[PDB]
Design a protein around this ligand. Structure first.
Ligand SMILES: Nc1ncnc2c1ncn2[C@@H]1O[C@H](COP(=O)(O)OP(=O)(O)O)[C@@H](O)[C@H]1O
Ligand code: VO4
Ligand SMILES: [Mg+2]
Length: 747
């Protein structure tokens, strides 16, 4: 029989065992290679078939899991179950029909396994659980950058509002314009986290929604790498705005703006949409290299779609122009340059070249030109002149705070489109920025990856720990599955006083803060810690010349990442000098007013916000969608086996599949079940042990003895029995009577 043995790029390959040695099996893919006995797995007999639930495989192991997902992917089936957990592999193209209104209708009220695997089925299951258990629900959509979390979040939201309700759906282009950006991992990367709650009444009908937003990436506002961009809105506005709007806002091609021109200044466009962009909007880079290519994104088309979206959800033209005005104001702010004053003030002056930028910025932000000049080049502390570098920092700090408060306003404005006075329960969907790394990793990556650690820990806690504790408490005798927990990595980062975030905070507060001093402290205070290393020990050449006090490696659950620690101290400080806060809070423009040691910890904001979020998640029933990124090239039909296997492993899916060999995803109190059916029962079953009625019910419903197991207080059901479980659980008088009548006929 063919078996699975290791392959360095496919993860596993098919072969036959031709020989055996002390520590090896000899695998024929006349040619042979050696494999460890424990690295060789049985294969499914039919290599061309697939199963919708990996629990249905004859052999449950990482190799058969990988292959099943692969076969499905090759047939454009991106969704596959492991019991009630969904695996979604990014197709990197639009699969026809699978998100249609017809498809949506077909999933309504269907138990898991009665329809093909789909995000819609996870959404419907959350809805069903909310109704049956009278408990708010969370759907956690996890995965690395570019895996498909945001797309799947949108599908869930569309499903729920279309089935059980639209403005929640329609508002999305607005959030993405202000909070998403091109990174090298994802053309449409989310640079903020969100928890979107759909709220329901007692009849389980949608009454409104609420979007909680988290931790916008502020550094991106001012600078980007050459392959990356600022937030979409800048490019959508420059590409799509009318000439009247362009003139009023003094806009031009992106290369004319410091806050855009260190990044990629090319638009997403195709042959057709390029013709719709006016010549005066195109940068030299765009004219030379042409447009950026994407199946989803198009700067001109997205500007139009965004404006349509704004109108549909109730934003008036004044509101729209206000938003654009602040965006342009931030752009002109960035164009203000400073120079050495010399012995006059000892500080700096605005460059003569920056006169227009000062004028435009002041006009758009409702500020007096001189007030802005003074606030950027001096500070009362005595009114002292600032040095050029401090002026640069003042400018950028103001820009970041203005844009960030604008984003806050956008999210608030969105919430105002679907408000509700009261609700019974909610279904919330969590979409965070996912695990990411690059040639050069900084504090932004450190914070993003920390959040991903925390979320993986929640999965481990809910699915691998608590599940097994339940089986144990109920006396089920399910074989224990051991796994590598990541709490130690979390503690390295967030522990009081000694954790990296607190050591960083300590540095910000020292007389002479230093990235090197901070980095040395991290290594010194964490001698021998398993989750920390020095850059010279990196697996990658690019990191080998970083000094011990210039970086560190964190052994994340998803892989080791080497961080350069330059700018960690400055990036940890969210504070805005009162001079700048006062300037903007006293703007002559109402809209801008309504948006609104010197040290505020960014790291402590990551920790505090995540812990609040985790509190909310812990109070809800949780469902999980594990998004998988198939390759690093954003291409369709390119399944990178080893890459995908790595994700299945670190996400915990291999551990979960192991547990499911003998686990039970569905359960209820058998006393409560008996109590529910009691009023309809004939004396002959009413008199017997409550487990006996249950057994009679199960058998009448066609369940076999192996499908269920009675614990101490709860009855448990195996994977693939969700349909029968859902039938048993219905509390409707008609349905209870129906099933008892079936039992009566069975007897
Ligand atoms: N189900 C899908 N169908 C079509 N394209 C998809 C799907 N999921 C992801 N994509 C593509 O992959 C890109 C990245 O997906 P996204 O959800 O933004 O990733 P992230 O996990 O970072 O939120 C999308 O912009 C889109 O091009
Ligand atoms: O590329 V993502 O939306 O996980 O940040
Ligand atoms: Mg995203």
């Amino acid at each position: 029989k063919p078996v699975w043995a290791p392959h360095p790029t496919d993860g596993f390959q098919v072969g036959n065992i031709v020989d055996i040695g002390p520590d090896s099996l000899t695998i024929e893919p006349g040619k042979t290679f050696l494999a460890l006995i424990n690295q060789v797995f049985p294969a499914e007999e039919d290599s061309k078939k697939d199963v919708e639930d990996n629990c249905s495989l004859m052999y449950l192991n990482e190799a058969t899991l990988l292959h099943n997902i692969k076969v499905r992917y090759s047939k454009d089936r991106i969704y596959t179950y492991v019991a009630n957990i969904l695996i979604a592999v990014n197709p990197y193209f639009d699969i026809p029909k699978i998100y249609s209104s017809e498809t949506i209708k077909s999933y309504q009220g269907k138990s898991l396994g009665t329809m093909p695997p789909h995000v819609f089925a996870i959404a419907d299951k959350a809805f069903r659980d909310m109704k049956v258990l009278k408990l708010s629900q969370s759907i956690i959509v996890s995965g690395e950058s570019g895996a498909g979390k945001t797309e799947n979040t949108k599908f869930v939201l569309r499903y729920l509002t279309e089935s059980y309700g639209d403005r929640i759906v329609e508002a999305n282009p607005l959030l993405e314009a202000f909070g998403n950006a091109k990174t090298v991992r994802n053309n449409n990367s989310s640079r903020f986290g969100k928890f979107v709650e759909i709220h329901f009444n007692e009849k389980s009908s949608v009454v409104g929604g609420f979007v909680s937003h988290y931790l916008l990436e502020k550094s991106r506002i001012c600078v980007q790498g050459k392959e990356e961009r600022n937030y979409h809105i800048f490019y959508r506005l420059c590409a799509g705005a009318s000439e009247d709007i362009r003139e009023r806002l003094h806009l031009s091609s992106p290369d004319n703006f410091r806050y855009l021109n260190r990044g990629c200044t090319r638009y997403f466009a195709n042959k057709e949409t390029d013709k719709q962009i006016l010549q005066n909007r195109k940068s030299p880079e765009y004219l030379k290299a042409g447009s950026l290519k994407d199946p989803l994104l198009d700067d001109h088309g997205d500007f139009i779609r965004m404006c349509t979206a704004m109108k549909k959800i109730g934003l008036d033209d004044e509101e729209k122009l206000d938003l654009f005005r602040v965006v342009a104001g931030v752009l002109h702010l960035g164009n203000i340059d400073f120079e050495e004053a010399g012995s006059t003030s000892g500080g700096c002056n605005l460059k003569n070249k920056s006169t227009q930028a000062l004028e435009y910025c002041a006009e758009l932000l409702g500020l007096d030109q001189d007030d802005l000049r003074v606030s950027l080049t001096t500070r009362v502390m005595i009114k002292v002149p600032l040095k050029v570098e401090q002026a640069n920092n003042a400018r950028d700090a103001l820009a970041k705070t203005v844009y960030s408060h604008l984003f806050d306003h956008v999210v608030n404005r969105v919430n105002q489109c679907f408000p509700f006075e009261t609700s019974s329960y909610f279904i919330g969907v969590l979409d965070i920025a996912g695990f990411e790394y690059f040639e050069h990793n900084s504090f932004e990556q450190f914070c993003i990856n920390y959040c991903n650690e925390k979320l993986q820990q929640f999965f481990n806690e809910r699915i691998l720990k608590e599940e097994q504790e339940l089986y144990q408490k109920e006396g089920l005798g399910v074989n224990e599955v051991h796994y590598v927990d990541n709490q130690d990595c979390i503690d390295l980062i967030e522990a009081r006083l000694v954790g990296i975030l607190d050591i960083l905070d300590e540095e910000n507060r020292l007389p002479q803060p230093s990235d090197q001093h901070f980095t040395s402290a991290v290594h010194q205070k964490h001698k021998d810690h398993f989750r920390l290393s020095i850059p010279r020990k990196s697996k990658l050449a690019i990191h080998r010349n970083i000094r011990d006090d210039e970086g560190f490696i964190i052994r994340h659950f998803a892989g080791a990442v080497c961080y350069e620690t330059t700018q960690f101290v400055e990036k940890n400080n969210d504070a805005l000098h009162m001079s700048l806060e006062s300037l903007i809070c006293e703007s002559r423009d109402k809209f801008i007013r309504e948006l609104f040691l010197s040290f505020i910890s960014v790291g402590n904001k990551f920790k505090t916000q995540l812990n609040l979020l985790l509190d909310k998640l812990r109070s809800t029933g949780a469902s999980f969608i594990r998004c998988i990124k198939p390759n690093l090239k954003m291409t369709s039909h390119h399944f990178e086996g080893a890459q995908i296997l790595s994700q299945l492993q670190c996400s915990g899916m291999v551990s979960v599949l192991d547990l499911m060999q003998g686990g039970f995803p569905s359960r209820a109190s058998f006393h409560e079940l008996y109590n529910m059916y009691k009023k309809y029962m004939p004396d002959k079953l009413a008199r017997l042990d409550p487990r006996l009625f249950c057994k009679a019910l199960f058998k009448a419903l066609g369940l076999n003895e192996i499908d269920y197991k009675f614990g101490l207080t709860k009855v448990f059901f195996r994977p693939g029995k969700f349909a029968e479980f859902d039938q048993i659980m219905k509390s409707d008088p008609d349905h209870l009577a129906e099933l008892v009548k079936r039992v009566n006929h069975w007897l």
